[PDB]
Amino acid sequence: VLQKILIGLILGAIVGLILGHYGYADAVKTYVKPFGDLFVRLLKMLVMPIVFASLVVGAASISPARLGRVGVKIVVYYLLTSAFAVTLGIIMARLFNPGAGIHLAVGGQQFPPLVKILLDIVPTNPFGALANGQVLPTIFFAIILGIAITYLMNSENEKVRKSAETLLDAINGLAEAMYKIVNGVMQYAPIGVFALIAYCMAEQGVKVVGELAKVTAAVYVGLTLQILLVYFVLLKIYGIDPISFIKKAKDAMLTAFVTRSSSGTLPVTMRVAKEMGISEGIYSFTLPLGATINMDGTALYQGVSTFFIANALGSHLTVGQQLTIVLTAVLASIGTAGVPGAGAIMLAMVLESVGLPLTDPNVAAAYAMILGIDCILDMGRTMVNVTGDLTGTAIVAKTE
Amino acid sequence: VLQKILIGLILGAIVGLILGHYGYADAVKTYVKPFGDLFVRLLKMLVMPIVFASLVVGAASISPARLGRVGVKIVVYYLLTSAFAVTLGIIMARLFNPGAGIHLAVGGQQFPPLVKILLDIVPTNPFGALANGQVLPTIFFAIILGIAITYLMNSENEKVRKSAETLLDAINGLAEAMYKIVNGVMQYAPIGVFALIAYCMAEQGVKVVGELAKVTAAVYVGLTLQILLVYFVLLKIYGIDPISFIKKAKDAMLTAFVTRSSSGTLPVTMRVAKEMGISEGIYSFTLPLGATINMDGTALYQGVSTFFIANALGSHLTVGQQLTIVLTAVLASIGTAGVPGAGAIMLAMVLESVGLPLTDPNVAAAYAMILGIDCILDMGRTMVNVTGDLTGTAIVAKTE
Amino acid sequence: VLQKILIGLILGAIVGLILGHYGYADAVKTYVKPFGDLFVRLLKMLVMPIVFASLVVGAASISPARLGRVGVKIVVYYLLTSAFAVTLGIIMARLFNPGAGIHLAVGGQQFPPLVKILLDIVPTNPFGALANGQVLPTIFFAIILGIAITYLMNSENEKVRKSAETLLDAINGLAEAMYKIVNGVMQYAPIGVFALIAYCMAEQGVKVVGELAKVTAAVYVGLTLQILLVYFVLLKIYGIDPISFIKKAKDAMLTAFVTRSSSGTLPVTMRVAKEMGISEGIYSFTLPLGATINMDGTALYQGVSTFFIANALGSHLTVGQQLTIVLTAVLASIGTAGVPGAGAIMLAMVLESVGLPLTDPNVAAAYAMILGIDCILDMGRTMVNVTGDLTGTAIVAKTE
Ligand SMILES: N[C@@H](CC(=O)O)C(=O)O
Ligand SMILES: N[C@@H](CC(=O)O)C(=O)O
Ligand SMILES: N[C@@H](CC(=O)O)C(=O)O
Ligand code: NA
Ligand code: NA
Ligand code: NA
Ligand code: NA
Ligand code: NA
Ligand code: NA
């Protein structure tokens, strides 16, 4: 009966698109949107406990072989599927030509060392990192905690074996409880989906016209091809049924699509991975990493929009400019956060790499138009972002 | 032997009232007051762990019937006992006439959407909400966690039943430990009560004179009538012996009276509810909620002081304005936090409701005079605030 | 094979001292130093969980006798060994005369009630204190929690005994797991030691010359005499073989020396105390306390530098001023935090005690010179600070 999410999604996208066409976006923002916001509030509630607990228990696996190999593989999957998404976005923005009318405007006025990021992946107080919603530091600590718990259960002493067993059970009992709540809040998901889709359709409905229609088309048709030409093809190569994969991932896909936060849909994403029969050692490490590392819809978006500005500015991006886009957009997609709208902010990075700084007021003009339709683009962008998460999660799972 | 709190309270209110009448409030603030502050520090120490643990364990009950019915009942009790307390304060401030001398002054210069409060009751990181002292968000998460733990203990699998039992046991052992510390710090309570009663008596002793004596009298007599005509009567109606109820609640009453923080006296309040034989499913959820939601002494205070200001300005508050006072003071008593002094700040809200803004310097004169005696009033105010918590807690407990 | 820390330390101090003598301190700060920083990041990661868990489990001991006696003894040991370290620094700074050349400079421009510290040792939300890295408040709460758990295990009811045993096991399983991680990160310690020692050798290598060489010499020779004439002698008096004690504490000593943070080396310090056969009731409470309370190398440093400044200004510190130096530097060493550089900051306190404020630009000249060589001093300073922790920890352990 949970397929009523589509019922809540489809006709919900209509009632908002109607009211917004009569100056009722304020009525949606005052009555309808709070319900969909509450849905996101409930989803964010479960992220930190379900990620920490499942990954401590998920570290009940061969630490050198399993964790090391699933890591060094999924990072190569993530890097390859993101480098292919930005090239596909380039190809889309090359077949298409979103920037046609050179529209100048005035008053745009837009706008972290690597060692300072890597050294912060290792926390200095996991109680704070858990209390501050830092997923990568708590992934690191929970990996080390579960491995230490496993080493405790293999000693000759029974007291330390009994204590480690008592700790790991309570942590698993927490994880199981968090998954049951995921099912509970996913039962309310059709209402929250209906509300969040009435908004962003009553607000950013009529805006998408002209050259904005081309860039939205170029992204979405490239996003579907990313699902088909990459995920579907690579799933069949490793012998994973694509139709059944999508039939299960409908929940996490649409939840990411409507919420636009890959970190907010991670509880649903983790539960779907449990539903398809994936080892906890796999999805509890692969998915929270890919939530902030694997952004395929972002790199495609970023590769399309980076042509739209230059195409609307007359700038001719040579093959070298396209390759620097491919490289820089991958790096920007890694840094892009699992929160709604972040990809538009880090899109500046690839714009700077091609000698198109946001300082130029003419560049800031087109940038303001993209942020005016980001809500639409971000929905499908996050969906493919999480779809690639579950794809490589299942691929590396069935690789072991 | 713990009744020496009264011994520490009574003669402690004298030694401060004596020393304060000879310019020794600095000696109390430098030597005596730190002991009562440490008492509050120990009480605040236990609030977050004892509330989270006891309510997770308290969620080992029929979730639809028990929790739903105890909720929809205690919220109506809270709304009715607060709406009666503000009317009783109005009746007191009408029998009395605190504002007689129109005293003008110079240099007063005094001085959250509902959806932003309701949507904030649902946390987004329970690790942080526990680390930030947010009782309403941790109440919500602990309800859902215990229900999920109960649903885990009813599955056919033994592993998830063992893990859920392991988790719920450690949480209960934490709650039990917190209650034992409550008894330990309650043994030191007579000293902290003696110290906190030397202060506010050495500081705010002779201050209460004239119109200040009238408004303080009208408040306390309404608070006693609220205790007698409401709590005692409704206790007897539901077959609860009032005298034995007071014999149980003596600890939480004097602690709330002395501490003035309903959230700081909540550990003592929770222990008293256990001692009088209440199930955790009832009191462990009702009390922390009512600590911040149910404030009857606040609504009575606010209903009395809002008359004193208008009476000291000559403005005639019509019967319609008196009804808006009843409504707004209830809302302000709901929003008032369980920390000392919040009710005087939330009095501004009902003052705005009657067209008496704090911007007007004549309004700021009487407002600053009320804040100059708030300490004394706040003591009895918090006492009735927690008394109404324990009253309805026992009523709805014996209703099941 | 872990003795390769010395291999990483010794020749590591050379490769930095070489590269730093050719303008390659930036190459060390950009490539070498991040490795030693990561080592400190991993060490800080374990401090809060291993201290809370081990001390809750360590509270499984006779609370009045054991904890009370180990406390009232180790606080007297700490006060005596710190009062002797500052006198030894005075004797060193009197045998030596670091301040010889009165060097005036321009542009120095340098630069908490006791009740507010004591009352802050008692937390008001242990979830926050754990999430904020506050070791003294979590020490207090963990003492009270473990004692309450012990009182729970001695009741006639079996349910509360089972829950308390379930809680204490999971906490012990956490402590054991943290100790296993301490061994894991201590295996990486030789690399982090090699990186942190190449730094402050490439940075502060040639700097120590002249009066800087004299004050640094006076500090270290007093630190060694503090180790020999105090620790070694008092160990032998209480029947502890000094050579075997060093063979155990070699890890914590070199880690403290290299990290300069007594709180960052506390996990290694706690593990060494376990390896040398100390009950958790003693060391797990004594060590985290002494980490921030017992700093003998700090008081010696402060006693030496306070002479160097006055000697570089010509002011004659009388015997009475020398006694106030002893007292205030002990207080400054008590208040000094377990983070690198705090002792130089707390040196201002004893400088104010002798009428030598940092406001005087001539005082700020010598002060800036001491802060220009504080890094090396701090290395040996922290080493003796933690050495005195483990010394008295073992003494009071074998006293029970
Ligand atoms: N919505 C994306 C971020 C973005 O595309 O800006 C995510 O949460 O992963
Ligand atoms: N002292 C009250 C608040 C107030 O009266 O301002 C309470 O904590 O409930
Ligand atoms: N490094 C010392 C502080 C100092 O000497 O400044 C410590 O952490 O204990
Ligand atoms: Na993602
Ligand atoms: Na990303
Ligand atoms: Na309130
Ligand atoms: Na209350
Ligand atoms: Na100190
Ligand atoms: Na120390």
Amino acid at C173: G
C157 is in an annotated binding site: no
B167 in contact with A, Cβ within 8 Å: yes
The answer to the question of whether B374 is labelled as a binding residue is no
Give the number of whichever ligand sits closest to the CA of residue A292: 5
- Report the amino acid identity of residue B379: M
Rounded to whole angstroms, how far apart are CA atoms B53 and B45? 14
The enclosing H or E element of B244 equals helix B242-259
Please state, in angstroms and rounded to a whole number, the distance separating the CA atoms of residues A270 and A278. Answer: 10
CA angle, A318 then A324 then A329, to 5°:
125
Note whether A149 contacts C: Cβ–Cβ < 8 A: yes
Q: How many C-beta atoms surround the C-beta of residue B116 within 10 A?
A: 10
Q: Is B239 buried (19+), middle (13-18) or exposed (0-12) by CB count in 10 A?
A: exposed
Q: What is the resolution of this structure in A?
A: 3.7
Asked whether residue B341 is marked as a ligand-binding residue, the answer is: no
Q: Which ligand lies nearest the alpha carbon of C264? A: 3
Number of C-beta neighbours around residue C163 at 10 A: 25
**Contact between residue B55 and residue B139 where contact means Cβ atoms under 8 Å apart:** yes
DSSP labels, C282-346: HHHHHHHHHHHH--HHHHHHHHHHHHHHHHHHT----HHHHHHHHHHHHHHHHH--SSTTHHHHH
CA distance A292 to C295: 43
C174 in A contact zone (CB under 8 Å): yes
Fold of B3-398: Proton glutamate symport protein (1.10.3860)
How far are the Cα atoms of A336, C8, C18, C378, C391 from residue C11, in angstroms, in the given order? 42, 6, 10, 20, 29
First CA to last CA distance, chain B: 34
What's the CA gap between C277 and A13, in Å, rounded? Answer: 68
Contact between residue C250 and residue C329 where contact means Cβ atoms under 8 Å apart: no
Helix, strand, coil abundance in chain C, percent, nearest 5: 75, 0, 25
By Cβ distance, the residue of A34, A45, A127 closest to B141 is A45
CB B393 within 8 A of CB B74: yes
CB A376 within 8 A of CB A216: yes
Our CA angle for C151, C153, C155, nearest 5°, is 80
Q: Helix or strand or coil: residue C95?
A: helix
Asked if residue A258 has its Cβ within 6 Å of ligand 1, the reply is: no
Complete DSSP assignment for B296-340:
HHHHHHHHHHHHHHHHHHT----HHHHHHHHHHHHHHHHH--SST
User: How far is the C-alpha of C126 from the C-alpha of C124, rounded, in Å?
Assistant: 7
Q: CA-CA distances (angstroms) from residue C272 to B105, B244, C36, C181, C283?
A: 69, 57, 21, 13, 10
Q: Return the residue whose CA atom lies nearest to atom 5 of ligand 3.
A: C343
Q: How far is CA C117 from CA B188, B319, C143, in A?
A: 20, 53, 18
Q: Which amino acid is at A4?
A: K
Indicate which atom in ligand 2 lies nearest the CA of residue B386.
9
What lines the ligand 2 site, CB under 6 Å? B 260-262, 295, 298, 336, 338-344, 378, 381-382, 385
> Which residue of B131, B173, B184 is in closest CB contact with C166?
B173
Rounded CA-CA distance A374/A346 in Å is 13
Neighbours of chain B (3+ CB pairs under 8 A): A, C
* Residue among A112, A123, A136 nearest A331 (CA): A112
Burial readout C35-56 (b: 16 or more C-beta within 10 A, e: otherwise): bbbbbbbbbbbbbbbbbbbbbb
Superfamily, domain C3-399? Sodium:dicarboxylate symporter (1.10.3860.10)
Task: Quickly tell me which residue has 């969040």 as its tokens.
Answer: A196
Report the half-sphere exposure of B298 (CA within 13 A, side-chain side). 41
Q: In this structure, which amino acid lies at residue C145?
A: L
Closest among C167, A218, A92 to B176, alpha carbons compared: C167
CB spacing of A163 vs C180 below 8 angstroms: no
Task: Kindly state whether C119 is in contact with chain B, defined as any CB-CB distance less than 8 angstroms.
Answer: yes
Q: How far is the CA of A288 from the centre of ligand 4 (A)?
A: 8
Distance of alpha carbon B177 from alpha carbon B45, whole angstroms: 13
Q: Is C181 on the interface with A (CB under 8 A)?
A: yes
Note whether A29 contacts B: Cβ–Cβ < 8 A.
no
Residue A384 CA, distance from chain mean position: 7
Say yes or no: CB of residue A295 within 6 Å of ligand 1.
yes
Structure tokens at A384: 């493919």
Tell me how far apart the alpha carbons of residues C246 and C226 are, in angstroms, rounded to a whole number: 14
Ligand nearest to the CA of C385: 9
Amino acid at site A367: Y
SS3 of B69-116: the string is HHHHHHHHHHHHHHHHHHHHHHHHHHHCCCCCCCCCCCCCCCCCCHHH
The Cα B281–Cα B273 span in angstroms is 11
Q: Give one word for A99, left, alpha or beta, with left for phi > 0 and alpha for psi -120 to 50.
A: beta
Domain boundaries along the sequence of chain C: 3-399
Q: Exposed, middle or buried, C217 (CB in 10 Å: 0-12/13-18/19+)?
A: middle
CB distance from A184 to chain B under 8 Å? Answer: yes
Neighbour subunits, A (≥3 Cβ pairs < 8 A): B, C
Burial of A101 (0-12, 13-18, 19+ CB in 10 A): exposed
Angstroms from A294 CA to nearest CA on chain C: 25
- Tokens at B113, concatenated: 């959407």
DSSP letter (8 states) at residue B354: T
Q: How many CB pairs under 8 A join A and B?
A: 83
Tell me which chain B residue has its CA closest to the CA of residue C169: B170
Contact C172 A152 (CB under 8 A): no
Q: Which amino acid is at C322?
A: Q
Tokens 């404020």 map to which residue? C357
Chains that touch C (3 or more CB pairs under 8 A): A, B
| Cβ atoms of residues B132 and B261 within 8 Å | no
Contact B280, B58 (CB under 8 A): yes
Q: Give kind and range of the element (H or E) at residue C246.
A: helix C242-259
Measured in angstroms, how far is the CA atom of residue B318 from the centroid of ligand 7? 30
Among protein residues, the one whose CA lies closest to atom 4 of ligand 3: C343
Minimum-distance CB partner of B122 among A45, A133, A169:
A45
